[PDB]
């Protein structure tokens, strides 16, 4: 069943998110191009789909690995050793669309020659939802400010409440999304390494390193 | 023979060829703003052992992930020639070696 709340990771400070929210980049609305990551690559970032996650454990472990990156970075010899991260709470509405169901609809409609097996696995693993072109601040409810102090190692978590949040009873759309036939060509899917997170999800959080997923799934 | 250590480089090329009666394996490293380092490993002397295959798998895995590496090379007795590989290390993912 569709959920009522969604969560997203970001680094932009909360003092300006509440007046601006998050926005997409362009007008490309093809589904397979978004899932494979070709529309989120550097120099080719033109997508109309903002990607969010509906499970908080995945975002928490992601943020934990991001925080731990700074410790080894400092020990290597660059950076102070302090980290500031955030986790956001967004209300779900009828304008959102699921990812796994839309991918399976596309694959069924256009045949197996256009499908890619690991794309659906990535979609189901991250339990993602697409917010279309715009995700207004009115659905933003609460934020979490995570702080890591390198001088002593203590971890601190704090929360705040939005002054513009509006309460309504509305859940996510049950109908999967449909897209036209792709006009480009795809070699593989782009996946960040340690942990396995879809390219389109991590590119909007921040050079960047992206590696084809089908190359690592087996042991050399 | 002299031994030197290189840190924070990236694999840029990779080859596997038949040279003489034995197979050979070579790789080229890269770092911004300095010279390149090249070394080769040959399945000669070693035989009836799995050393060569394991080193090949490690090097291919290092190249696939596009991660930074640390390498040890033995000086060539004559100039303009690849040396002999001794040790390979994978730096932490999305990071730098210490």
């Amino acid at each position, epitope marked *: 069943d569709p959920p009522a709340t969604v969560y997203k990771y970001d680094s932009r400070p909360p003092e300006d998110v509440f007046q601006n929210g998050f926005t997409a980049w362009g007008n490309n609305d093809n589904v397979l191009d978004h899932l494979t990551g070709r529309s989120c690559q550097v120099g080719s970032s033109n997508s109309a789909f903002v990607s969010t996650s509906s499970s908080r454990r995945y975002t928490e472990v992601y943020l934990e690995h991001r925080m731990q990156e700074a410790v080894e970075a400092e020990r290597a010899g660059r950076g102070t050793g302090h980290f500031i991260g955030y986790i956001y709470e967004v209300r779900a509405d009828n304008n959102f669309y699921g990812a796994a169901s839309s991918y399976f609809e596309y694959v069924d409609t256009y045949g197996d020659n256009a499908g890619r097996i690991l794309a659906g696995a990535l979609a189901t693993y991250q339990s993602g939802y697409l917010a279309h072109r715009r995700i207004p601040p009115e659905n933003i409810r609460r934020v979490t400010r995570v702080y890591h102090n390198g001088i002593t190692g203590e971890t601190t978590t704090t929360e705040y409440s939005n002054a513009r949040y509006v309460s309504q009873q509305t859940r996510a759309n049950p109908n999967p999304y449909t897209s036209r036939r792709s006009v480009a060509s795809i070699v593989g899917t782009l996946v960040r390494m340690a942990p396995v997170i879809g390219a389109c999800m991590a590119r909007q959080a921040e050079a960047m390193v992206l590696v084809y997923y089908e190359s690592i799934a087996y042991s050399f | 023979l002299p031994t030197h250590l290189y840190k924070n480089f990236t694999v840029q090329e990779l080859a596997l060829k038949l040279k003489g009666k034995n197979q050979e394996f070579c790789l080229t490293a890269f770092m911004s703003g300095r010279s390149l380092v090249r070394a080769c490993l040959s399945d000669a002397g070693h035989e009836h052992d799995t050393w060569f295959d394991t080193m090949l798998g490690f090097a291919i895995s290092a190249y696939a992930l596009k991660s930074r590496i640390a390498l040890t090379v033995e000086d060539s007795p004559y100039p303009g020639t690849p040396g002999d590989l001794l040790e390979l290390q994978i730096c932490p993912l999305n990071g730098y*070696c*210490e």
Partner: antibody, heavy 115, light 105 residues
Framework: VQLVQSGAEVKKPGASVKVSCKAS????????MHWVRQAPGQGLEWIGN????????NYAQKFQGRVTLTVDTSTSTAYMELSSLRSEDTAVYYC???????????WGQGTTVTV | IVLTQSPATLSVSPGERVTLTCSAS?????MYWYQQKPGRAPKPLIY???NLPSGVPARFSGSGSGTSYTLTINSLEAEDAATYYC?????????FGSGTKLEIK
């Protein structure tokens, strides 16, 4: 804990110079040291750093191929060497300590170099 | 990273209250501060932000936010005739401000 360095030098362009910064009063093996220079009437500028306990160094992109940082554990003295000098290299050179956190605390004298 | 300070030189009467601001081209989390005297080495003054080290007088404080930080001088004396710089170490490599010298009327 203090840092004592060499004197002021004058050199002919095209040669190379080598500067020392001796440290005493604490275990030198487990602290980084930073190299920063200040041109006359200009702001500070970063060169590189070295960790004595591991021997790993980091250099700026624009000094790559020109500079080399070395440390001698016997005398607890760090050495900085710069080659292929030009007239733009005339500056005052400093050595400072890092605390793996906190801030730079102990600086040193000038050791001006004229080219 | 590019850092800008203003004014280049500051003049003030004794005992007054004055501040200096150093801005950045991109947002950074923290803003260090340093004091520098002629003919000698500069000395640390603030670390992280709004956090004084041991030995520096309490008459100095700083505050700010992203892409804009300030240093507040609340008790001026003849000792304060020096130069101030601000440093970032969040993205390699560090950058230093050009600096500003203080003059007493």
């Amino acid at each position: 804990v203090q840092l004592v360095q060499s004197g002021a030098e004058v050199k002919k362009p095209g040669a190379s110079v080598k500067v020392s910064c001796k440290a005493s009063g604490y275990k030198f093996t487990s602290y980084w040291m930073h190299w920063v220079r200040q041109a006359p009437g200009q702001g500070l500028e970063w060169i590189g750093n070295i960790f004595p306990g591991s021997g790993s160094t980091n250099y700026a992109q624009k000094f790559q191929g020109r500079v080399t940082l070395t440390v001698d554990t016997s005398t607890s003295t760090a050495y900085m060497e710069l080659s292929s000098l030009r007239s733009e290299d005339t500056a005052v050179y400093y050595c400072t300590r890092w605390l793996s956190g906190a801030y730079f605390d102990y600086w040193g004298q000038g050791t001006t170099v004229t080219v | 990273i590019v850092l800008t300070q203003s004014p280049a030189t500051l003049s003030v009467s004794p005992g007054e209250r004055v501040t200096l601001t150093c801005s950045a081209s991109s947002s950074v989390s923290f803003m260090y501060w340093y004091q520098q005297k002629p003919g000698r080495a500069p000395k640390p003054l603030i670390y992280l932000t709004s956090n004084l080290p041991s030995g520096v007088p309490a008459r100095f404080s700083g505050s700010g936010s992203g892409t804009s930080y300030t240093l507040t001088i609340n008790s001026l004396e003849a000792e304060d005739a020096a130069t101030y710089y601000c440093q970032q170490w969040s993205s390699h490599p560090p950058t230093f401000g050009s600096g500003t010298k203080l003059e007493i009327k």
